[PDB]
């Protein structure tokens with residue numbers, strides 16, 4: 001890939017974040033947050049390590065703007081916010097791990113996705129419940145009710161985007 005193709009890819013990833021990080025799952029009007037799939041897909045495909053911290057930086061300034069200027073609720077922003085970072089890293093590591101084996105991969109992909117997203121969900125949903133300070137008496141039961149509610153739609157968002165990456169790749173492979 002030329003420098004130009006790299007810049008193009010870079011901008012399309014930042015733009016995707018820009019356009020989707022205000023929706024955790026799909027609505028009639030809007031695309032859901034591509035962020036979790038992106039970090040996973042960076043794990044799968046992109047060797048350069050520096051891209052991950054760069055794309056984290058982008059996510060953070062995007063959230064700040066969305067809320068400061070874009071009129072988006074700041075409900076979700078709290079001391080627990082930084083727990084996004086280990087979730088992003090877990091997803092990236094997930095994609096690295098999936099690429100290591102099977103260097104056919106599909107039923108293996110599903111199992112890897114479910115596990116790696118579950119780690120991200122614990123860190124984020126669990127981080128928020130336990131450390132946002134918006135919950136006076138957080139319990140294990142309470143944690144699990146919330147994982148049960150949020151995991152399916154956020155997993156579906158992830159599978160939407162990773163699904164498409166897969167079908168793009170298999171296509172391009174033929175081509």
Ligand code: B12
Pocket residue numbers: 021022023024033062063064066067072073075076077078080081082083084121123124125127128132146149150
């Ligand atoms: C709603 C929401 C939003 C809304 C804004 C808030 C709002 N509109 O109230 C939107 C979509 C705008 C939003 C945006 C963001 N969000 Co938000 N958001 C959520 C969500 C889905 C719920 C908030 C919540 O927990 N409220 C607290 C109460 C109301 O809900 P609860 O604790 O679960 O309890 C109630 C429900 O379970 C309800 N209930 C029980 N059963 C049932 C059944 C039904 C049918 C219903 C409807 C309700 C219901 O009753 C309970 C009352 O005790 C959570 C999901 C999650 N927790 O994983 C993320 C979450 C809080 N958001 C998060 C983040 C980070 C963001 C962003 C800052 C960036 C991002 N995309 O990651 C952006 C904003 C910046 C930007 N735009 O660029 C993270 C926080 C991560 C962390 N702290 O480490 C979370 C935890 C998502 C995640 N798993 O990553 N978000």
Ligand SMILES: CCCCCCCCCO[C@@H]1O[C@H](CO)[C@@H](O)[C@H](O)[C@H]1O
Pocket residue numbers: 003006007008009010011014047048049050
């Ligand atoms: C939003 C704008 C996007 C900017 C993208 C252009 C810069 C690309 C840098 O190249 C990357 O540098 C790695 C460093 O380790 C190398 O391994 C490898 O050459 C490549 O992956």
Ligand SMILES: CCCCCCCCCO[C@@H]1O[C@H](CO)[C@@H](O)[C@H](O)[C@H]1O
Pocket residue numbers: 009038041042044045046047099169
């Ligand atoms: C959302 C992240 C998107 C990044 C896509 C650009 C990186 C290009 C990937 O190059 C190589 O391509 C082969 C087939 O495409 C892969 O098998 C290989 O593992 C990968 O390293």
Ligand SMILES: CCCCCCCCCO[C@@H]1O[C@H](CO)[C@@H](O)[C@H](O)[C@H]1O
Pocket residue numbers: 001002006007009010013045046047048051054055
């Ligand atoms: C701010 C985020 C920037 C993200 C931009 C990612 C650019 C893609 C990385 O470069 C390319 O990666 C392929 C797989 O590693 C290599 O096949 C190719 O030779 C290399 O040039």
Ligand SMILES: CCCCCCCCCO[C@@H]1O[C@H](CO)[C@@H](O)[C@H](O)[C@H]1O
Pocket residue numbers: 079080081082083122123126127130131
């Ligand atoms: C059930 C999921 C558990 C997640 C593991 C908790 C990590 C350590 C707890 O410290 C947390 O560290 C974050 C950054 O270091 C801060 O954002 C947060 O305020 C702080 O309390």
Ligand SMILES: CCCCCCCCCO[C@@H]1O[C@H](CO)[C@@H](O)[C@H](O)[C@H]1O
Pocket residue numbers: 140141142144145146148
């Ligand atoms: C039966 C398997 C063992 C469950 C693990 C023990 C922790 C407490 C369980 O939390 C509860 O789990 C229910 C399903 O088990 C959910 O429907 C409910 O919303 C949730 O709050």
